[PDB]
């Protein structure tokens, strides 16, 4: 029956469906442009020169830089076209572009693989009030652990093999998100040395009365090499990245190093 027809065979529902397919293809192009605001252009794996297999859609592939305005009055561009140095403290196992790298030295201190981090700003994340967000409870007297929970302070810090790394001496809290981000651990060896421990790299074990912070990521010997921070009461985004990357590398490297 003639109701929907546009031609002998063509009809409105079919036309509306192809109009959707045209829209959806255009949307995928838009979405893929947004996906390319970090990391692009692509580079040759060996030389690091800007190269990749590209069609004529290359001309629409990467968007003009959008500018984010930060409440400090600084800005961030995306794409910024900044890229990592071509040289790293590792070498390929075979000369082909697809080959993996082997670390030249200690990968955890050389910051390669899961020990690698981004060169974030040497600035702390800020509260809406402009104060640094992540600070020890020593400096945030209005914060407290909820009365229902175990306070980590004074607990021993223990690795997966049962060696004591130290004791918890402070909590670093995020004033903006209202959460514990790090524990500040005084080391058992070189007593008086303090290191940050990412709180999500821990759990509290309380099956036995002398409850303890267990750390699966790294062994007790690795705590002495945890990256240091420049200030005693604030931490930059770069220092956060450096510390968190170090512990994330433990699952691959801690039985090597």
């Amino acid at each position: 029956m003639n109701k929907g027809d546009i031609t002998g065979y063509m009809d409105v529902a079919q036309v509306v469906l192809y109009a959707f397919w045209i829209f959806f293809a255009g949307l995928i192009i838009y979405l893929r442009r947004e996906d390319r605001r970090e990391g692009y252009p692509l580079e040759d794996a060996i030389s690091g020169k800007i190269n990749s297999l590209q069609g004529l859609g290359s001309v629409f592939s990467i968007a003009r830089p959008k500018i984010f305005k930060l409440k400090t009055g600084a800005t961030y561009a995306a794409p910024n076209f900044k890229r990592d140095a071509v040289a790293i403290k590792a070498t390929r196992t075979a000369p082909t572009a697809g080959a993996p790298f082997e670390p030249t030295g200690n990968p955890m201190t050389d910051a390669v693989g899961p020990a690698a981090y981004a060169l974030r700003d040497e600035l702390p994340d800020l509260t809406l009030g402009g104060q640094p967000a992540i600070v020890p409870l020593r400096v945030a007297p209005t914060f407290s652990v909820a009365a229902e929970d175990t306070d980590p302070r004074g607990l021993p810090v223990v690795d997966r093999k049962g060696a004591v790394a130290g004791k918890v001496t402070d909590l670093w809290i995020d004033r903006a998100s209202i959460a514990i981000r790090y524990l500040e651990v005084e080391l058992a060896a070189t007593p008086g040395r303090k290191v940050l421990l990412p709180f999500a790299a821990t759990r509290i074990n309380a099956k036995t009365k002398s409850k303890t912070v267990t750390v699966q990521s790294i062994l007790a010997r690795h705590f002495a090499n945890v990256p240091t921070i420049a200030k005693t009461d604030s931490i930059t985004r770069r220092e956060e990245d450096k510390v968190m990357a170090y512990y994330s590398s433990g699952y691959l490297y801690s039985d090597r190093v």
């Binding site: 959707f20 949307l27 970090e38 930060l70 914060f143 929970d149 956060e240 990245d241």
Partner: protein
């Protein structure tokens, strides 16, 4: 086992606070509370809520609609509380029959449904203005209101816009638990199996894709949560190793990746397109395609019967 970051073991407390907005006619209502179990999943603060003129309007219109429905349901069991509970899921308020067109039917013959539907519609559209204006008050983008507009477009298509195209309310949706399910069943059968409606197929693909994306994205951010990945807007404005490793996991897995910002555009568009393509599939049904299986046979979805 390492910490999987599914529940917050130790959670902190502080004085409740919130971002400033300009003074209105109504302050933020309620004393902020805290609950321990919400603090395990997420933030503990059962904070104050903003009212405002648009909030008053939406709740008043919506309350009247809910009362008109609820009173009609209880009247349909002759006010018995026992039969109300016994029959609750089966109770419904029905639209008018087709002979009334789009004019006001008698109250008992779907006039109450028309009033309830109008008041519910108005309340929802006022809630859209609320979702919009709360973003502008916070100097935030209006993305949430425009996502909500797609859900509303399906709701309006079901309840009013297709009736307007059909010239009567008889195939509009009844207010009732099993009744609106029965409407969904009968609508598919009357128009020749909704599986053959390609816009229902699209709507399903985006419904499945939404659960796919949230499973992928939720698992991704938790996988990088020991690297600070849950701090997404900070990662958007200063790319950390968490955003780098999230990108590389997907690139190495499937050959391509998003950014920390653009994955939220993929999320936004998939959920929007579920209801948008849904609404189009409803508006084409009976207006230009009377039997979707027969349309499918014409366009090669099935062999000729």
């Amino acid at each position: 086992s390492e910490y999987q970051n599914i529940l917050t073991g130790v959670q902190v407390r502080t004085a409740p606070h919130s971002a400033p907005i300009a003074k209105g006619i109504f302050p933020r209502l309620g004393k902020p509370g805290f609950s321990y179990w919400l603090g395990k999943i997420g933030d503990a603060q059962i904070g104050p809520i903003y009212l405002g003129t648009t909030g008053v309007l939406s709740l008043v219109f919506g309350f009247f609609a809910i009362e008109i429905i609820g009173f009609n349901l209880l009247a349909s069991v002759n006010w018995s509380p026992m039969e109300f509970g016994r029959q609750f899921f089966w109770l419904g308020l029905e639209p008018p029959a087709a002979e009334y067109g789009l004019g006001f039917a008698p109250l008992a013959e779907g006039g109450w449904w028309q009033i309830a539907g109008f008041f519910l519609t108005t309340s929802i559209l006022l809630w859209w203005v609320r979702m919009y204006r709360r973003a502008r008050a916070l100097k935030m983008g209006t993305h949430t209101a425009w996502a909500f507009a797609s859900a509303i477009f399906l709701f309006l298509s079901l309840g009013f816009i297709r009736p307007l195209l059909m010239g009567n309310f008889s195939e509009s949706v009844p207010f009732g638990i099993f009744p609106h399910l029965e409407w969904t069943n009968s609508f598919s059968l009357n128009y020749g199996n909704f599986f053959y409606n390609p816009f229902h197929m699209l709507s399903i693909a985006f419904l499945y894709g939404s659960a796919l994306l949230f499973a992928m994205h939720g698992a991704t951010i938790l996988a990088v949560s020991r690297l600070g990945g849950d701090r997404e807007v900070e990662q958007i404005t200063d790319r950390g190793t968490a955003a780098e490793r999230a990108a590389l996991f997907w690139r190495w897995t499937m050959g391509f990746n998003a950014t920390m910002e653009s994955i939220h555009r993929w999320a936004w568009w998939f959920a929007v397109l579920c209801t948008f393509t849904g609404a189009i599939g409803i508006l084409l049904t009976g207006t230009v395609v009377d039997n979707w299986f027969e349309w499918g046979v014409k366009h090669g979805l099935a062999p000729a019967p």
